[PDB]
Structure formats: structure tokens, C-alpha cells
Design a protein around this ligand. Structure first.
Ligand code: ADP
Ligand code: ADP
Ligand code: ADP
Lengths: 418, 424, 267, 18, 65, 427
């Protein structure tokens, strides 16, 4: 619904031969970068590779993040795409190593065919036969059904306090009886369908949800009930004997033909913010066989690595990690490319602009920056609509440029030291 | 079909390529070149499989891209699952709930394996009837026999708390835990609607009712976590306690394992602890290892550092390998030599064979000449990159033109630093 | 006691946003944590692989049963083809469902196992100076611990017992404000929400509340306070002289008369 | 083990006779 | 608040035995049920804490400990 | 019984007279007359205890008797008066702030003593008859002067049965609460041994009156009061030092109620002393909090030991004397301890070797004083124990000069260790 910074990016504008079009799929310019992005996205679709990192390096304002979002969109929704800011690694509840490992194992997806089934309807009679079974009568707008449930489900029924007249769901797979309420005839309406709901659930799940489900036990009837409270803090899942068993069971299911693996894509932003210990643990962990493919993004050039204060490296990344990482360079845009990006943003946000206004807006973008010329779009249209004019003339952008200063005039003013 | 562990960086390392006399072969199972370092790796691997001594430490040193992690993975793969090979990084110890010493202690205890063997007399059979009036009787059944058992107070209490019904295949051991192993044999048709999440109707057992169940399982010496709390097994799947008390860790568990090994009920099997990039460790962890290697039942350490004369973290003193000399004295340093035009092309060919990429000889030559000027892992990545660029090109064999296309598309560290002249 | 309980007035649709019966996956086939304390190693490793119910036997068993034995030894219109076919087909679906569920509820084995956990687990007191429960003197754990050392450790019950002399007089801190139960919830919730919370609270009250009996003493003093019964007598010189006279006269052992002229003064 | 069945045969014969 | 204290057994029963492990207190005076007004003083932080870490009663909220 | 003789176990108190005139070598302490007189003046002001929050700073050279004067003050102050010894580095905790740890240290040396007149009954049980139908019975209590009978009530019988008191037993009964306490077995407590009996520890029967009124006293520190009042877990004083009492009504209420108690005569005050050894470890935040924590009316007196001189303050780069900011140094009264002369070092060594039960010869004393004047008095003192062991090994009677010389050649002090550190020694 509401427009965002990268909402206009639909995907990599590449043709069948892999060459990048001058302007397509919401992206313009950056032909070599887009072609490299496509080359690496083909790896994701191949899925036969692991432990590969690609670093989008370039000055600020470049389309590195836009290219990452385009890769994610072109991949779609079947394969997971996990974005993470380098700043997010500095967690206080769990160590950075385990945050990184959790993100790496959460990027990986897993599609499975769940053939569940749930009986639904209003209760008409409950009779337990020290109980061999329980006969329950269910009613919907397709007829009545007599059901024989294991005595272990009679406990769940009694605990849910269901009785003749209440609408209930009873899942054949687990026995998770849920009392929706009392029928409207005495409240929830009577279900209108086949009481025997049978359908295939092709819903996808991530490989980190499996670890989260086994980290803490779920149940009760003992002092264990005290475990449901106490903040439920997230804590480190030991690599020794938990994720290994998860991998083993997932492999068993894949061999049996129930589960299906779909390796996802990770997306780290402002990689220069990670500590050197995070960097080295990362270049050590991404060598594993189960690691997904990662897309690093750099925003600064040669600087000092955090945690060293005595070692400088290109892009704030140590050479130990920068080696084995493919570097895709993103360069500044030209005036024509900036005008094209501004026009795309305008026609995506819904603002119609004259030619003389767009020309001077592209001039302002080449003068200060593309992102600034982009930000100057909405207020111009707002002033136009306030004045009655539905479109943007040159008298609006050149007047909002005086209301909203830039990062250069602001510093020129601050030069007064007060 | 794709598995969880697809081909990665060191997937080509399917073991250590040595002979029966530890002689390194030029072309072997995964490993290539590095004859001296690989022979040293085999020597330490034999010392591992021996396990007669404790407190050994080998440090593989060399420039980045010479095969330190490769030799580590080769040793790991040659050391079967029989003995533990705990491969941790040099930064997996900087925890918030655990100190920089308890982490190393747990890592050490995790690299010591213990094969527990347990024997127990077990009664298993289908429950035909349970009468109770307190005292009562129980009629167990199996295809070989049907029996009677009189129940006592505790037996009846456990039976009632388990709610075992007729047909259930109950299982009873001495010092009754009364594991309700399987579900119901008969009384079917509950599937008409639903089944309990724990119901596994699978048929009634056969053979004799009483049996002797010998069960063998390999655990780690980190089982102190299995005692450190009321419900211990739960803390073994997540972070767990900040640190288990030494007054139990270092005496009680050790004495009990010694008693088990004396009685013959268990046996310890030492393993390996591979600490990669150990140069990140603080002087505290090094001063701790100084004594930890002096302990009685410590595993063997394998370190892999790529740093030369550098400052030690937490201090301002420069030292070889960036770690203290008092620790280097207690190590055994192996050196990995940089690959040549001969070995680089060989490992590149092995990496191509890994993913089944058919490369021409000109492409091999050009990729080797590229990798000898920029980096080895760079040329390794170029393999798959050109493979994909040619597969999109409706090709079957990677060629020099497709390799140069990728060479121009993806930059390396050197050319990137060179092109970093704009300075944003 | 603040009568204005700040009950949360959050919206109604948000009481349960994750509940979706037909849009969730069977995480049961990935539950490894639940196996450790319920399933045995011998169960998954040796029994199931050989006693896995086969579909052939599952179909065969669906036949006419037989009556049990009777031991007494003391010595050495017509039906519808469509309807019956639908019945048969739904019965076949039922049999397939049992075949599927029984095989799916036993696919994963434990990580450690019941017997492994029982073998690794030592007497609950691991390194405590007091010995564990010993069935008798027939083994070391009875003769290897001393009662003189057992007395050296005081449980919280003994601590409360020995502190009761000062707990009665030194616990006086009243909280400045007291709040009723933490927070109610104004909502149009799913009917199945409150019953579960009520059952949980009832279980907790039946389990732990009986154990909280000892702390009732401290709770009383920390919840309410009353005069010391000497508050003003410590300073009442008249009452002090009265007590002095009474104590000097009671040593003689004679009757004493007292006069007062006020019901309230009498009280 | 098979003593149970050996005895079952005898008792079944006795029952069928009486 | 709902709290109930045991002031001790009525003084009229003190003659029942020569010695007992019982506190004795005379018959309370006045009306059985009585409402009294008190002008207390508390800070806003007091209410803040009372509502953040509630104790109350009628429940097992003692798990606060 | 067995509590070894530490470094400061030789001083039993300040060797002062009634007029606070320090004697040369009386009561363990030797020399240091000016600082000992200052210590005595502050100790008299302490035993007076009508002024709160006063600070003293005992500065001086290393090993000149500052901690010695502190332990002497502690001993001369004895029990019934809180004395809390803490090193400056002990407040750096991980679960509580430095200011909270300092508040704990202060409030831990403030004693509140409730004096109660609860009457009891002390005698030797002669018979305990009880009939279950509520069960009812009687008791016969005997003392050396008289015998009496008591009709036991329901809860009385319950408590008697729970405590399992029998005949011949000497017990005390708190009539107010009914608490029973058996003190021992009287000669009559003889069980006429004919069964599995293993106790024959008899004691004289209680003397005096049957129903006497004795006085009890309950002394607990403000620290313990606020700790047990913090939360329902009224055992943190022993359970664990998990703390963090908010400064809300809890502590203010403790203070207000102790004020009312002092006013009404329930328990007034007993001030205390806080000996902070090596105070230079405290942080700038610690000093800034102390600045105003010394101003509270419930503030006990404090004495801070100092070895440092003009040195930076911890947590900052401010050069200040004693390593303490002048802000706090202004509240303090500074007492300087001087170095011991030859005859003072010799007398200290003599007292130490006589306390640790080691006989030294007249030349042994001379050589040891020489070693202790050329090197640290602490090294000279530690030499005594080492020299006595060689003598005992060679089966001697008193330490000679050759044993002390062997020990000097065998063990090294800091100066000779540094001069021997001529190699790299893994710098
Ligand atoms: N090739 C492109 N075509 C169209 N718009 C682009 C392109 N590259 C960047 N942009 C726009 O310019 C802005 C730059 O944002 P971002 O990609 O975050 O820059 P950076 O490269 O610094 O991450 C985005 O709003 C994006 O929509
Ligand atoms: N001797 C070798 N045998 C097989 N493969 C090798 C050999 N040396 C290097 N390689 C390949 O080169 C890649 C990079 O080597 P790597 O182990 O990362 O070097 P380092 O140990 O210095 O980090 C490895 O993934 C491996 O596949
Ligand atoms: N006046 C004294 N009388 C007796 N012994 C003393 C005297 N002064 C110092 N000592 C002894 O010297 C030893 C170390 O000196 P110490 O009192 O610790 O001074 P400092 O605290 O400055 O190191 C102590 O064991 C103490 O017994």
C-alpha cells in the first residue's frame, strides 16, 4: 500500500541472454552490477552450492541495497530472504556468534507437505465407553457425524470443558481440541461445510523454527509449568547435539520424500559495523557445507575495522574475510540515470511532473544527490495540491529546496561553530 | 534431490590423503600438495587414535589460502564418528552468560567421548487386564506366553498415574520406571476421528516376555550438565547454566567415570579440539590453556592461525602468531607452504570435478594464471561463476572467454582496492 | 490498596493473532525435546524397527474377533449399493489414516534416551556435603556420610525456625501502595482463552500454594502492621508507676482493689 | 516359554472334554 | 486488602489451662464492623511500583519472588 | 579452638592507659605513639557514639602498622559493637552497584538491639502424663528449691510431643510463645539403661526460682533489617548476597521506624566502625557518593588505610594525594604512621616470634633486625617461621644466626628478585 524507499524495485531488469537493459524492472544504469546480481541469483536457483558470499561495494547513495532487494523480489517468496543490519548483531540477550548462526540457519527454508485433517462442528452428544474410547456427535450444514476418539482425547475434551451445543475443532493428527465457543442457536455461528475437513497444507517453514521449537520444552502437568513464565529468554542452541540432530531428521524426511529443502539468501547491511571477531567467525562459518548464500553490503571505502583501531582495510572488512568474497562494484550515477530514477520514483508514487520541473530536479540531484532529489518529490506535490495545481511545476521543487536544506548546506551553515 | 549439507568450501576434502606409512601422496582423496604439513597432520592423527597421552597441541601456520582449514577438515573426516572432533572457531568462546574460561572448559570436556553400555532386565507385553481393589493383578500378554503379576502399592500408583489401558504394550524394568513404550495393540477405529499425539499402535511384541536389553550410546564428558540441575537434560539443548561448579565438574564426574571404567560399564575415548583462528583469543584464555594442557585428561588441540608478528589482543606486545611465547613453548608448530603453478591447477581441477564442471585445458590454464596473481579462493569461486555464465550461454564446457567474462564481472580485493580511487 | 486496577483495554482482534487451524504445520514430527523424558533408547532403536505395524497386518486384523477364555482349573427392504460402497471407502480412508499416523508418531528417535539419562544422572546431591537417600547400610553411600556434617547445613525451614525470633519484631516494612491482581483485560476474546488460564492458575495453586505455608508468617508482617502493645506504655509514667506498685504488692500475696470510672477506661 | 502353550493345549483338551 | 491477623485467643479462655502456647488478647471493643478514614500520603513512584510489580492477592502472584 | 595465628593475630588491642597515653610495647602494639594515641582518641569517640559519619584516614609507608592499628582498634572495641573490615576492591560487584555496596557496608556496621523482658519457666521435668481420648495431661516441674504441677493444654502437649521432651530433662518454656528449649539431661535423666541407649551426658538441675523473669536481647544490623524487609525471601543474609534494595520507603521506613524505636526506648542505637583497607581502589563514583553518605545521621565511623601518595584517582586522570579526591579528603582527619626505628623493628620481631612460639638467640635477633632494617619488616617477620623450620628439622631448641642466614639465602625478597631478573624472563 504505502510507498517505501525500495518499493519501486520489481527485480533485476535482465533479458534472456543475461545482459542488463538500460532501464527495466524499476532499475536503471548499473549494467555490470545488475548482470553480476543475475549471475549470482542463478546460483540461488541452482541450489547446489553453499558457503558463498557476494559483497556489493560502493559509495553511499548507490543501488547496492536496491540490487539486493531486486534479487529478493526476483527470487520471490518460495525461497526465504533474511535481511539483517550489521548493527543488529550487537545483542545483549545472546552472544553475537549465536546471533549470526541463528540468522544463517534461519535464512535456509524448508517446504513440507502436511496432510492434516480436522473435524469441526457443534457437539450433539459425548459418551465415554477405564475408557476404551469416546463417541462424539458433530453437526454442521452438511449433516451429522458420529466420531470415535481415543480416550487420550477425552482428557483434552474435559479440559476444554466442551459439552452438547458447543462448536469445536478436533485435529485428527494431534488431538488439539479447541472450543470455538457455543453455537449461535443457544456465541459462534454453526460451521457450514464438510465436517471432515481434509486438505493438503503446503505451507513453508524455516530451519530455525525447528531449533526454536526444541530449545524449550512445551507441556505441563508438573513443576515444568513454571517454565512457561520467566521471560522466555532466547538462549544459545548448542551446535554439538541440537542442530546436528535437526539436520539428521530433516535429511531423513527429505530422503523419505516428505520434506523439501529450499536454500534461502542472507542479506547483511553495513558490514563494516561488525567486529573483527564477528568477521573471523563469519569467514570460518560460511565455509561449512550447510551455510546459505550471503549478500554483504558495504557503504564506506578504506577505513579502520571496528575492534582493531590499528589496522586499516578496504571497505572496513579484513582481508581474511574479503578474500573468498566476490566483490561487485556499484558506481555513481550520471545526470541521465538520475533523471530516469527520479521519473521512475515519481510515476511509482503517483505524481505527474512537467518537463521543466523534472529537468531542474535532476539538476538538483546531480548537485547534491539522487536520494535528496528523490526526497524532494513528495513536498512539492503537497504544495501543488495545497495551491490547487494537481501537477508539479518548477515553482514548487525550487521552493521546497529552500525549505528543506541538504547535508551540504547544513554543514556550510554549521561551519559557524555555533 | 538436494540434501542439507550440499557441496561447500572444503567438501572436496574427503579425508586425509596419506599412505599406510603416513607418506603423503601427491594426488589423493581430496588433499593435494602440502606434503610436509600433511605428513605432520597424519602423525598427529595417529597420536590421536592412540590416545595414550594428554595435553598435546599442534599449531598449523601459513599464509591465507595454503590449506590449514583444508588439513583440519581432512583430519576431521579421516577421524570417523567413533571419536569426537569438536571444531570451534576462535570467537565462539566470547559468551555473555559464560566467562572466557568456562567456555574453553566446556569445549575441552566436549571433545572427550565416553561409550556407556547399560544392561537391564525388561518385561514387555500386551496388557490384557488390570484388576485392582489396595492390591490387584495384571495380565501381560505376548505371542509366546501370557502371564499373571501381583501388584504392590508403588506399582499400582505408577500404573494409575500412567493410565495404562487394556491392549497397551506396557514395559516394566526393575526399579520400575514403567515406560509406557507403545500404544494400543487393539481397540482400533479411533482413527475414525483422531489419534493422540503419542499413540503408536504398532503391534504387540513377539518372543519371550522377559529380556535383557544391552544399550550402548556415545556421550561426551560434558555430561556434568546432565547433573548440574533438577531437570538436566533440558539444559543440554540450549545455553544452560552460566557455569557448572568445579567442586563437582573436576572431581565428582571424573571419579564416577573412573569407577565406571574400572567396573567395565563405560570407557572414555579422547578426541580432538580444533580451534580455528585462535589468534582472536585473549591473553587470559592463553594463560588458562597454559595449565589446562597440564591436566590429566585434556584432549589434543589443533590451532590454525594466519597471523605473523602481530599484537596480542588485550595487550600491546607483539609476538609470533599473535599469541604468548609461554603458550607457543607448549605447542608443536607445523608450517604450510604456499601452492605453486602445479598444485593450484590440481586443486582447481578437483574443485571443478566436485560440481562436475567440464573445463577446457585453456580455461584451466587461464584460471590458474589468474588465481596465482590474485588469490586461490577467488579462482575457486570463478569456477562456479563461469559454470553458471556458460550454462546460461547454452553451453556445456567452460571456456577462456566465459572465464574472462566472470573475471571482468566480479572483482577481487586487489582490483577493488585499486578502483577505490573515488573515495566517495 | 488501589481500587483502580489498570486493566488493559487493548483491542479484541489482537487477543489471538497466531491461532489458525488450517494454516499451521505439524511441528510434532520435529519435536526432539519432548522425546528425552518420555521415549526410551530401546524403544526407538530396537523395538519399532522390527515391530512397525505393516499395512498388510493392519488390513488383516480388521476381521471377526474372538471371545476371551473362561478358565476354571484347580488341578496340576434392501440396502443401497452406493451407501455400502461409501461406507467401505470411508473405512479404507480410516485404515489409511491410522497407518499414516502410527508411522508418523514414531519416525524420530531420542537424542540421548531415558536409560542414558538415568545412567548419567547421579544421586540428586552431586557435590553437596550431605549424602543422598540410601536404602540402607548395605552399600557405601550410607556409611560414607556423617550426621554430624549433615547437621552443619540448615535448610530454609530451619533458617525460618531460627530467625522466627527476629522475624516477629524486625519485619515491619509496609509497601507505600498495594495493587490488586496485576491487570485484567477488557476484550471480546475467544471463549477458549480464560478457561486455560483458570486451569493453569488452579494447578499452580494446588501444587505450590501448599508449599508456601511457611512464608505466610513473613507475608503477614510485610502486608499488615499493628501497635506493639507497649507503644505508649513505654512512656506512660502513670502506667509505669502502676506496674511498679503492682509488682511490689504481688510479692506480699494479698488482694488488691482497683477503681475506674469509664467503660472505655475499663476496656 | 513354550511350557505355556504345552499347558494351554492340555487345558483346552480338558475343557472340550468337560 | 483481605489480610486477616490472629490477635490471639480471647482472654476469657486464659483460665482454661495453667500454661499454653497461645497468645491471649481480650474481647475486641466497639462495633463488629467499622469503617474508618485515613489521610495517607504516597508518591507517584509508589503507585508506579505498585502497578509495575503488583502483589495484590486472591491469586498465586507470590511467584513474583 | 584451632584458628591459626594470622599476620595480625599478635595485637590484642591498643596499648593505651586510662588517659589514652600509648605505652611502648603493651598489649601487642609497639612504637607508633602518635598514631596509636590518635587511634585511641577516635576509639573513645566511638565508644561514646553520639556523633555519626566521621571519617579518619590512616596514611603511611608500606608495612608500618596501619592495618595493625586497625586490628588493634577492632580488638579493643571487642564485640557488642559492629566492626566491618573491607578491602577497597570488595565493592566492585557484578550484581549490585558500587553505591549500593557502600550503603550495605555502612548499614552493616549499625546495630539495633531490642531488649525484651519475656518471662519463661525453667525446671527439670519429673513426669509428663497425657491421655488421648483432644488429649489432656499434666507436667511436674522440679527445681532444687521447689516442685510444681502444670495442666498442659492442647498446643502445649503438641509442642512437647514434637520436641520429644521426657522426664529428667531440663527445659525452658517461653510462656509468651510456648517455645520449648531443652538445655540438657539432668542426673535423673538416666534412662535406667536396659535398651539401645548411647547418651549419658548429665548436668546439674536448674537452680533458683521456678518461674523466673529473665531478660533477652536481639541484636541485628540495619543491613540485616533492610535485607529481610526487602522481599518475602527473608534469608538473603545467609542464602546469598543477591541484593539491590530500592532506596524507596524500604530503607527510609527502616530509618523512620528505628527513630521511633529509639524515641520510645525500644532500641536506640549502637554505632560501628568501617575499616576500609586499601581505599585507593574505590572509584571516583564511590568517593562522590561517600561525600554525602558520611552526612547521614545513621552513618557509622570509618577508618581508611592509605599507602599511596600523589597518584591518579582511579576512574579518571586527576592527580590527588592518597589517591583520593580533595572533596572527600576534606571530611577526613589524617593520621600519619611513621617508619619504625631499629629498636622498634627489633621489638616488633621479638613480639612476633614470641607470639608464634619461636625462641630466637640474642644474635638471631640482631641479624634479623639487620635484615629487617635493610629490607622490609614484613620480609623480616616472614623469615622467622621459615628459620624455625630448619631448626626443628635439625632438632634444635632455639633459632640461631646460621638458620636465619640459610633461610635468607634460600628465599628472596622483592629487591633481590628484581636484581636477579637479569634475563628477559618473558617480559
Ligand atoms: N538501478 C537503479 N534504478 C532505479 N533506482 C535506483 C537504482 N539504484 C538505486 N536506485 C534508487 O536510489 C536509492 C538508493 O538507495 P540504496 O539502494 O539503499 O542505496 P545504497 O546503494 O547506498 O544502498 C533507492 O531509493 C533506489 O530506489
Ligand atoms: N592440498 C589441497 N587439497 C585439496 N584442496 C585444496 C588443497 N589446498 C587448497 N585446496 C582448496 O583451496 C581452498 C582454500 O583453501 P583453505 O583451506 O581455505 O586455505 P586456508 O586453510 O589457508 O584457509 C579449499 O576450499 C580447498 O578446496
Ligand atoms: N608497633 C608495632 N608493634 C608490634 N608489631 C608491629 C608494630 N608495627 C608493625 N608491626 C608488625 O609488622 C607487620 C607488618 O606491618 P603492618 O602492621 O602490616 O604495617 P603496614 O600495614 O603498613 O604494612 C605486622 O605483622 C605487625 O605485627
Amino acid at each position: 500500500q504505502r510507498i517505501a524507499s525500495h518499493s519501486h524495485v520489481k527485480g533485476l531488469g535482465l533479458d534472456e541472454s543475461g545482459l542488463a537493459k538500460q532501464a527495466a524492472s524499476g532499475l536503471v544504469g548499473q549494467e555490470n552490477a545488475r548482470e553480476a546480481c543475475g549471475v549470482i541469483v542463478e546460483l540461488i536457483k541452482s541450489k547446489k552450492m553453499a558457503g558463498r558470499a557476494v559483497l556489493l561495494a560502493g559509495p553511499p547513495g548507490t543501488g547496492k541495497t536496491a540490487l539486493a532487494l531486486a534479487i529478493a523480489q526476483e527470487l520471490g517468496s518460495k525461497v526465504p530472504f533474511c535481511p539483517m543490519v550489521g548493527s543488529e548483531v550487537y545483542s545483549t540477550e545472546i552472544k553475537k556468534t549465536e546471533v549470526l548462526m541463528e540468522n544463517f540457519r534461519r535464512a535456509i527454508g524448508l517446504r513440507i507437505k502436511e496432510t492434516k485433517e480436522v473435524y469441526e462442528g457443534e457437539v450433539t452428544e459425548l459418551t465415554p465407553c477405564t475408557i476404551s474410547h469416546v463417541i462424539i456427535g458433530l453437526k454442521t450444514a452438511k449433516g451429522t457425524k458420529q466420531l470415535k476418539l481415543d480416550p487420550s482425547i477425552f482428557e483434552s475434551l474435559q479440559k476444554e470443558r466442551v459439552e452438547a451445543g458447543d462448536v469445536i475443532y478436533i485435529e485428527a493428527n494431534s488431538g488439539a481440541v479447541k472450543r470455538q465457543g457455543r453455537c449461535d442457536t443457544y456465541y459462534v455461528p454453526l460451521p457450514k461445510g464438510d465436517v471432515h475437513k481434509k486438505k493438503e497444507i503446503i505451507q513453508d517453514v524455516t530451519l530455525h523454527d525447528l531449533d526454536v521449537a526444541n530449545a524449550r520444552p512445551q507441556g505441563g502437568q508438573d513443576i515444568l509449568s513454571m517454565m512457561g513464565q520467566l521471560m522466555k529468554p532466547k538462549k544459545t542452541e548448542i551446535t554439538d547435539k541440537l542442530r546436528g540432530e535437526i539436520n539428521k531428521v530433516v535429511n531423513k524426511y527429505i530422503d523419505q520424500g516428505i520434506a523439501e529443502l529450499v536454500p534461502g539468501v542472507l542479506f547483511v547491511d553495513e558490514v563494516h559495523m561488525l567486529d573483527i571477531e564477528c568477521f573471523t567467525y563469519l569467514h570460518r562459518a560460511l565455509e561449512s557445507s550447510i551455510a546459505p548464500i550471503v549478500i554483504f553490503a558495504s557503504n564506506r571505502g578504506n577505513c579502520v575495522i571496528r575492534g582493531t583501531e590499528d589496522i586499516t582495510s578496504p571497505h572496513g572488512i579484513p582481508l581474511d574475510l574479503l578474500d573468498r568474497v566476490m566483490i561487485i562494484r556499484t558506481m555513481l550515477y550520471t545526470p541521465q540515470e538520475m533523471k530516469q530514477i527520479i521519473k521512475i520514483r515519481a510515476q511509482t508514487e503517483g505524481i505527474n511532473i512537467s518537463e521543466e520541473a523534472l529537468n531542474h530536479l535532476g539538476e538538483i540531484g546531480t548537485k547534491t544527490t539522487l536520494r535528496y532529489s528523490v526526497q524532494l518529490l513528495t513536498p512539492a506535490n503537497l504544495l501543488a495540491k495545497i495551491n490547487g495545481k494537481d501537477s508539479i511545476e518548477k515553482e514548487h521543487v525550487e521552493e521546497i529546496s529552500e525549505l528543506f536544506y541538504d547535508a551540504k548546506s547544513s554543514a556550510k551553515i554549521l561551519a559557524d561553530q555555533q | 534431490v538436494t540434501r542439507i549439507e550440499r557441496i561447500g568450501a572444503h567438501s572436496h576434502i574427503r579425508g586425509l590423503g596419506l599412505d599406510d606409512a603416513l607418506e603423503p601422496r601427491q594426488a589423493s582423496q581430496g588433499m593435494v600438495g602440502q606434503l610436509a604439513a600433511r605428513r605432520a597432520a597424519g602423525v598427529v592423527l595417529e597420536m590421536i587414535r592412540e590416545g595414550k597421552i594428554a595435553g598435546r597441541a599442534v599449531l598449523i601456520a601459513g599464509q591465507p589460502g595454503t590449506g590449514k582449514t583444508a588439513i583440519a577438515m581432512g583430519m576431521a573426516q579421516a577421524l570417523g564418528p567413533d571419536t569426537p572432533f569438536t571444531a570451534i572457531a576462535g570467537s565462539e568462546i566470547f559468551s555473555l552468560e559464560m566467562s572466557k574460561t568456562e567456555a574453553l572448559t566446556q569445549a575441552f570436556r566436549r571433545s572427550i567421548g565416553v561409550r556407556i553400555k547399560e544392561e537391564t532386565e525388561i518385561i514387555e507385553g500386551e496388557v490384557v487386564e488390570i484388576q485392582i481393589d489396595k492390591v490387584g493383578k495384571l495380565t501381560l500378554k505376548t505371542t509366546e506366553m501370557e502371564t499373571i503379576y501381583d501388584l504392590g502399592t508403588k506399582m499400582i500408583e505408577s500404573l494409575t498415574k500412567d493410565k495404562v489401558q487394556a491392549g497397551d504394550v506396557i514395559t516394566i524394568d526393575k526399579a520400575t520406571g514403567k515406560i509406557s513404550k507403545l500404544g494400543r495393540s487393539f481397540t482400533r477405529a479411533r482413527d475414525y476421528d483422531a489419534m493422540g499425539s503419542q499413540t503408536k499402535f504398532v503391534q504387540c511384541p513377539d518372543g519371550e516376555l522377559q529380556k535383557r536389553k544391552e544399550v550402548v550410546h556415545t556421550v561426551s564428558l560434558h555430561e556434568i550438565d546432565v547433573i548440574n540441575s533438577r531437570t538436566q537434560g533440558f539444559l543440554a539443548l540450549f545455553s544452560g547454566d552460566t557455569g557448572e561448579i568445579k567442586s563437582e565438574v573436576r572431581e565428582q564426574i571424573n571419579a564416577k567415570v573412573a569407577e565406571w571404567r574400572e567396573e567395565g560399564k563405560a570407557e572414555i575415548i579422547p578426541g580432538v579440539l580444533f580451534i580455528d583462528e585462535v589468534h582472536m583469543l585473549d591473553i587470559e584464555s592463553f594463560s588458562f590453556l597454559n595449565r589446562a594442557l597440564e591436566s590429566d585428561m585434556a584432549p589434543v588441540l589443533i590451532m590454525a592461525t594466519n597471523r605473523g608478528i602481530t599484537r596480542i589482543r588485550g595487550t600491546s606486545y607483539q609476538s609470533p602468531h599473535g599469541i604468548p611465547i609461554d603458550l607457543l613453548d607448549r605447542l608443536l608448530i607445523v608450517s604450510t607452504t604456499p601452492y605453486s603453478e602445479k598444485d593450484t591447477k590440481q586443486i582447481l581441477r578437483i574443485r571443478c570435478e566436485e560440481e562436475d564442471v567440464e573445463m577446457s585445458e585453456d580455461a584451466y590454464t587461464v584460471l590458474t594464471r589468474i588465481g596465482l596473481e590474485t588469490s586461490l579462493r577467488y579462482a575457486i569461486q570463478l569456477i562456479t561463476a563461469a559454470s553458471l555464465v556458460c550454462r546460461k550461454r547454452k553451453g556445456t564446457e567452460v571456456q577462456v572467454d566465459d572465464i574472462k567474462r566472470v573475471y571482468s564481472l566480479f572483482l577481487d580485493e586487489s582490483r577493488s582496492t585499486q578502483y577505490m580511487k573515488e573515495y566517495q | 490498596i488501589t481500587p483502580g486496577i489498570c486493566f488493559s483495554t487493548a483491542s479484541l482482534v489482537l487477543r489471538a493473532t497466531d491461532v489458525h487451524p488450517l494454516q499451521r504445520i505439524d511441528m510434532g514430527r520435529f519435536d526432539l525435546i519432548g522425546l528425552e523424558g518420555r521415549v526410551s533408547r530401546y524403544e526407538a532403536d530396537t523395538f519399532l524397527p522390527r515391530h512397525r505395524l505393516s499395512r498388510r497386518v493392519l488390513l488383516e486384523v480388521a476381521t471377526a474377533p474372538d471371545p476371551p477364555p473362561r478358565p476354571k482349573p484347580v488341578k496340576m427392504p434392501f440396502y443401497l449399493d452406493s451407501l455400502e460402497e461409501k461406507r467401505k471407502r470411508q473405512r479404507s480412508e480410516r485404515l489409511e489414516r491410522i497407518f499414516q499416523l502410527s508411522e508418523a508418531h514414531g519416525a524420530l528417535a531420542p537424542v540421548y534416551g531415558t536409560e542414558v539419562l538415568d545412567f548419567c544422572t547421579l544421586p540428586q546431591p552431586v557435590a553437596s556435603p550431605i549424602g543422598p537417600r540410601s536404602p540402607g547400610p548395605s552399600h557405601p553411600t550410607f556409611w560414607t556420610y556423617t550426621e554430624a556434617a549433615h547437621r552443619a547445613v540448615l535448610f530454609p525451614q530451619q533458617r525460618l525456625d531460627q530467625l522466627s525470633e527476629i522475624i516477629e519484631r524486625f519485619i515491619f516494612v509496609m509497601p507505600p501502595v498495594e495493587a490488586p491482581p496485576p491487570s485484567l483485560h477488557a476484550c471480546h476474546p475467544p471463549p477458549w482463552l480464560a478457561p486455560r488460564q483458570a486451569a493453569f492458575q488452579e494447578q499452580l495453586a494446588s501444587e505450590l500454594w501448599p508449599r508456601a505455608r511457611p512464608l505466610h508468617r513473613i507475608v503477614c508482617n510485610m502486608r499488615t502492621q499493628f501497635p506493639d502493645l507497649r507503644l505508649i506504655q513505654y512512656d506512660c509514667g502513670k502506667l509505669q508507676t502502676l506496674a511498679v506498685l503492682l509488682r511490689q504488692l504481688k510479692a506480699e500475696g494479698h488482694r488488691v482493689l482497683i477503681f475506674t470510672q469509664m467503660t472505655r477506661m475499663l476496656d | 516359554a513354550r511350557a505355556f502353550k504345552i499347558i494351554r493345549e492340555a487345558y483346552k483338551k480338558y475343557i472340550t472334554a468337560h | 486488602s483481605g489480610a486477616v491477623k490472629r490477635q490471639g485467643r480471647c482472654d476469657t479462655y486464659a483460665t482454661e489451662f495453667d500454661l499454653e502456647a497461645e497468645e491471649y488478647v481480650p474481647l475486641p471493643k466497639g462495633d463488629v464492623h467499622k469503617k474508618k478514614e485515613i489521610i495517607q500520603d504516597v508518591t507517584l513512584h509508589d503507585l508506579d511500583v505498585a502497578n509495575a510489580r503488583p502483589q495484590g492477592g486472591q491469586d498465586i502472584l507470590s511467584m513474583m519472588g
